[PDB]
Symmetry: C3
Subunit: 103 residues, 3 copies
Amino acid sequence: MEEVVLITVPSEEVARTIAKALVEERLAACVNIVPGLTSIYRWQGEVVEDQELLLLVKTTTHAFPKLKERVKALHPYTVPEIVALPIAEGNREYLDWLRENTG
Amino acid sequence: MEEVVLITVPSEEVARTIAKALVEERLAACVNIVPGLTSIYRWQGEVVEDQELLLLVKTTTHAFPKLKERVKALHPYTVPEIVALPIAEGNREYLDWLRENTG
Amino acid sequence: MEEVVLITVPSEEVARTIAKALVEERLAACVNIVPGLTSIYRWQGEVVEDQELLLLVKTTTHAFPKLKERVKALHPYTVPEIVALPIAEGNREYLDWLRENTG
């Protein structure tokens, strides 16, 4: 089954490097980089704020384990956000393309 | 039945044309246009990069068939991205509004 | 179950107010604020436009009830958009951190 994976990154350099690696390695068919995020989260009991970018990764459920391994290898954070949202339905031509361009 | 549909487009013009049509035609209760995307994907087997915008469509599975048809008619890409993410739960009054303002 | 909640707000001021509150109150582990949204939606027989910002809230189904309550108390809209998308799978360490920082 196809999924849209969300990944937040600290900079455009990390956004581009991870985005390119995932597509190049066939772990994703496409990756969108959304810039300008202001992120507020908890870290060791403190609430902190930082500027980030969001990656939207179009991939499949069986590509997830390797995708995670590669993202962790490239991401500067010890616990990076990598969460997959299920694609309940989509246009057939697109889903076929996604499948054909992954794995 | 409620879902959030993601569609990427090449320009603000196409974004607005599609957003307007979907809500006007009761295929969506609302559409968010997110600008500034950088997209990295597979085309003809090779890795390319392009600039795009993201549409977040609030709709339902009942509206999806016609939504797909209309997006394809109004979208320049040969294979446009039209993927639905399911809404697992939400503010009751908002979901009621979404269901009422769609179809 | 872990979820990504979407909320649209009218200004950065409301975005920040809700973002800080949910995280400080442990109703969410992190909140991303995405600016620059153009929203096209239905108001009766009219298709209207407005500027907004998007909040991506990392939380759980268990915090959702209280999260909805707090968002409504801090949101100027009569019917704020609060919809949850299910996280099918994710980086184990990340989901652990998410659950440990939300109640």
